[PDB]
Design a protein around this ligand. Structure first.
Ligand code: ADP
Ligand code: ADP
Ligand code: MG
Lengths: 359, 344
């Protein structure tokens, strides 16, 4: 029937023109809401960085680890907690007292530690560079704090979990995030790729578009696809991760570069997270990176004019994440034992140098 | 025929475009729901972070409010208002750098079109903390006709800060009841004119009350409001002493909320209390050991709440009009000083 089709056409043109109206209306509403969301997120980002600055871009904590059951044969120093920020230690055979942003003790949990870290993940997603260090003498607890164990995972695994939850959430703001992951060791001022068997010469050079930024030539830089992929990469690197004189004396750096793209407004947001399990602080090139790292941190705090980031592999690698608006957290790991007393004091004296430098 | 064919084509295409546009209406509906929810979460987190910043800073808090022209005043000329961000506001005569400050940064600036609820949104955190033993003080400052009373009291159609505090107060309380805390609320209302105090129903002897329910307090609130060019020069104070009790442990929280709608700041011992407030702010900025809290009967009460910290919030109400310009600048330059006060 011609009339049935005709009257259906008329009906469908009505339907059509009214839907175009209910669509145009929705579209305008969606435009203004999106714009207010973007602005609101810039302001949220700003306030967040304000908090970070009010707490200090560079912060230092202490963490005294508990003895293991296999360590009862070892006597502990006498530890005294003057307050949340101040700890003192006494040789069991004149005062050694140290102030920190916060002191963590043997009962302090892995998540207690991560609470200091989680706000900075958001910072990384906001375009700020982050550095998280574990500092201290071999046996003090650097690796347990950074990697941890399956029953109690440390900073890195928790950082990954939070990174995926947050990147997921961001999709609703119109942002899409890449993660570039690189894993390396630094031993005797030479860089090693923890994702490769191959022997190669890796150099630290200026980034193509940012001369203040850096990149490592000939390194395996992975674009993360999903959590399974990143779990595989971390496992692999942990397997090749370091021999007493070399295990104790090699730095480990896990770098997660967050690259965020908002396609509609055509904006980017690049911020990286460097998670560093430092070489032991126990007393040429073997210790170059560590001493230069402490020099650089203190120099930044003293607002020193010129800073020789390139005096060592470590400081040069992390340079773009140390100066300026970058945030640093350093966990000074300490073992509670009398026979470590002298090294525990050396470690904690760096903290004191930091406090003295903050004014 | 050719007409059946042509009509067939027409309906097919129209069915396909109907299906498209309906598909697009669906995607848009979903994306809009998502976007609104995200705008809500982002705003909420923004408010939380802002409150955290104000605490860490521990300055006296300053919010600036520009009131909209009234239906009457629709033919009254306004000066030029520029807003550079959420906390920065500039005003220029409708008619220069050497002349001083025309650009003012505060904790928050409220547009003429700001709801009473938006105002309260950024004050409620301060009120909730009174329950934790702190002395709180919200006070409104500005020339007459700028919106002090409207901001604190409000009108029945859109209630102000003081009214909404009740809701927030009992609501927050009944969650402490869960914790095993017991709260009583002592209330007092008073007025100050020519350095003389009046009970509108430490300080003694003035009418007190122990509150039972929101209605009891809404009532006595109305009663005080009922008894108020002298209201233009009279200060209004409303204190709500919150006294919590736990028997395990034996601790008590004692914290209060003070709500002041000050006299007008316009250029006139008639307006002294106000002048001595100005002097106490000048003193706190000097951070000096002897401070003239006692040179007036308002600064005496606000002395407990003028230690110079983030537990004190000042609204700086301002009129949009050109004939109010000079008064508005004066009000703003003062508010700038207040925002710089941190002492105790
Ligand atoms: N906070 C802690 N709680 C429980 N065990 C810990 C803690 N810190 C370290 N350990 C244990 O003590 C040992 C030394 O830790 P490790 O990270 O190897 O020190 P480092 O890396 O500084 O040499 C590890 O076997 C680890 O399981
Ligand atoms: N934010 C506002 N929105 C709409 N009208 C307002 C607002 N603030 C004040 N008004 C109106 O303007 C007039 C002057 O306000 P008012 O609070 O009496 O000034 P003040 O108390 O500072 O002398 C009032 O009658 C009130 O109705
Ligand atoms: Mg280790």
């Amino acid at each position: 029937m011609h009339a049935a089709l005709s009257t259906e056409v008329v009906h469908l043109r009505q339907r059509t023109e009214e839907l175009l109206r209910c669509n145009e209306q929705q579209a305008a509403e969606l435009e203004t809401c999106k714009e207010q969301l973007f602005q609101s997120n810039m302001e949220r980002k700003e306030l967040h960085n304000t908090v970070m600055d009010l707490r200090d871009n560079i912060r230092v904590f202490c963490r005294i680890r508990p003895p293991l059951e296999s360590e009862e044969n070892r006597m502990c120093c006498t530890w005294t907690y003057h307050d949340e920020s101040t700890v003192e230690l006494q040789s069991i055979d004149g005062q050694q007292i140290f102030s920190f942003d916060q002191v963590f003790h043997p009962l302090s949990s892995q998540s207690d530690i991560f609470e200091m870290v989680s706000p900075l993940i958001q910072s990384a997603l906001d375009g700020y560079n982050i550095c998280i260090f574990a500092y201290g003498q071999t046996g003090s607890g650097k690796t347990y704090t950074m990697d941890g164990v399956p029953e109690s995972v440390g900073v890195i695994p928790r950082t990954v979990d939070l990174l995926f939850d947050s990147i997921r959430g961001y999709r609703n703001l119109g942002w899409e995030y890449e993660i570039k992951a690189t894993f390396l060791e630094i031993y005797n001022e030479v860089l090693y790729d923890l994702l490769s068997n191959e022997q190669k010469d890796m150099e630290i050079r200026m980034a193509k578009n940012n001369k203040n930024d850096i990149y490592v030539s000939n390194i395996t830089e992975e674009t993360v696809l999903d959590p399974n992929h990143l779990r595989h990469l971390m496992h692999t690197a942990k397997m090749n991760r370091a021999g007493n004189e070399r295990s104790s004396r090699s730095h480990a750096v896990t770098k997660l570069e967050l690259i965020g793209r908002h396609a509609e407004k055509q904006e980017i947001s690049v911020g990286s997270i460097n998670l560093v399990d430092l070489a032991g602080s126990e007393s040429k090139n073997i210790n170059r990176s560590l001493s230069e790292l402490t020099n650089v941190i203190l120099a930044l705090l003293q607002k020193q004019d010129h800073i020789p980031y390139r005096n060592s592999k470590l400081t040069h690698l992390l340079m773009p994440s140390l100066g300026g608006n970058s945030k640093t957290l350093m966990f000074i790991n300490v073992s509670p034992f009398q026979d470590c007393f002298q090294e525990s004091v050396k470690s904690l004296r760096f903290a004191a140098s930091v406090n003295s430098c903050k004014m």
